[PDB]
Design an enzyme around this catalytic site. Structure first.
Site, PDB file in Angstrom:
ATOM      1  N   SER A 187     -19.482  -2.807  31.578  1.00 39.69           N
ATOM      2  CA  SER A 187     -20.867  -2.421  31.808  1.00 39.69           C
ATOM      3  C   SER A 187     -21.719  -3.674  31.669  1.00 39.69           C
ATOM      4  O   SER A 187     -21.626  -4.375  30.658  1.00 39.69           O
ATOM      5  CB  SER A 187     -21.316  -1.345  30.822  1.00 39.69           C
ATOM      6  OG  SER A 187     -22.448  -0.653  31.304  1.00 39.69           O
ATOM      7  N   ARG A 188     -22.531  -3.968  32.685  1.00 45.36           N
ATOM      8  CA  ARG A 188     -23.204  -5.260  32.702  1.00 45.36           C
ATOM      9  C   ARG A 188     -24.662  -5.158  32.276  1.00 45.36           C
ATOM     10  O   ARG A 188     -25.416  -6.128  32.402  1.00 45.36           O
ATOM     11  CB  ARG A 188     -23.094  -5.908  34.077  1.00 45.36           C
ATOM     12  CG  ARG A 188     -21.880  -6.799  34.223  1.00 45.36           C
ATOM     13  CD  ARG A 188     -20.780  -6.094  34.968  1.00 45.36           C
ATOM     14  NE  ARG A 188     -21.269  -5.613  36.252  1.00 45.36           N
ATOM     15  CZ  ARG A 188     -21.303  -6.344  37.360  1.00 45.36           C
ATOM     16  NH1 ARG A 188     -20.863  -7.595  37.350  1.00 45.36           N
ATOM     17  NH2 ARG A 188     -21.773  -5.815  38.481  1.00 45.36           N
ATOM     18  N   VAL A 189     -25.086  -4.003  31.765  1.00 40.45           N
ATOM     19  CA  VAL A 189     -26.292  -4.011  30.947  1.00 40.45           C
ATOM     20  C   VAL A 189     -25.936  -4.412  29.525  1.00 40.45           C
ATOM     21  O   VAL A 189     -26.801  -4.817  28.743  1.00 40.45           O
ATOM     22  CB  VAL A 189     -27.020  -2.654  31.004  1.00 40.45           C
ATOM     23  CG1 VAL A 189     -27.192  -2.208  32.439  1.00 40.45           C
ATOM     24  CG2 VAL A 189     -26.299  -1.606  30.187  1.00 40.45           C
TER      25      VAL A 189
END
Lengths: 127, 78
Positions: A116-118
């Site tokens: 997850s790139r948040v």
């Protein structure tokens, strides 16, 4: 609900049966095919649907829209045509395997391949 | 390849599904080992004592019939 300051969630179950119902409409209208007989604009079909999910700011209301699409692979090959379009559009994947489902791990989420790139900026301070 | 979600990765149970040299060397080793365990578990299964008594008698009955035959033979001869 995003335009009026509220919050929302949407689930597409599933997006791999929309690219098939659109391929049939193309090849009966005599459009030029491409890889796996999909038309040239199947990337433009899924991009302008997922880009409508946005986190608005306070000057417009503060609304939101969260999108969870479901995609069915075949024999765990994510390097197909439609499993590579929707991977490069979205942010992170949750990869449920079939081997861990019978070894006792249920829900069978593989955390080796899930990202997850948040990042950690969406967790509370306790978690 | 494998150091990404895209590339090919191997699962569990892939030596037997290939069916090569190591896939045949594994099937004939699970059988030549569990053939001897059908010997030791069957030879010690004959050591039930109640079966040996039953067999102490079937034999006895058989022998008593032979004796009966002989006794009849004597009766005749006499």
């Amino acid at each position: 609900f995003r335009d009026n300051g509220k919050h929302a969630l949407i689930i597409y179950d599933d997006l791999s049966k929309q690219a098939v119902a659109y391929r049939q409409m193309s090849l009966l209208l005599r459009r030029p095919p491409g890889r796996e007989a999909y038309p040239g604009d199947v990337f433009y079909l899924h991009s302008r649907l997922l880009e409508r999910a946005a986190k608005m700011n306070d000057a417009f209301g503060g609304g939101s829209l969260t999108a969870l699409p479901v995609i069915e692979t075949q024999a765990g090959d994510v390097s197909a045509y439609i499993p590579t379009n929707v991977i490069s559009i979205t942010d992170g994947q949750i990869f449920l395997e079939t081997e861990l489902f019978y070894k006792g791990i249920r829900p069978a989420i593989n955390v080796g391949l899930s990202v997850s790139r948040v990042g950690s900026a969406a967790q509370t301070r306790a978690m | 390849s494998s150091d990404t979600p895209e590339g090919v990765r191997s699962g569990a149970g892939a030596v037997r599904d290939a069916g090569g040299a190591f896939g045949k060397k594994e099937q004939a080793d699970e059988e030549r080992y569990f053939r001897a365990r059908a010997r030791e578990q069957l030879a010690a299964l004959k050591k039930h004592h109640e079966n040996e008594i039953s067999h102490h008698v079937k034999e006895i009955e058989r022998l008593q019939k032979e004796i009966e035959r002989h006794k009849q033979s004597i009766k005749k001869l006499k």
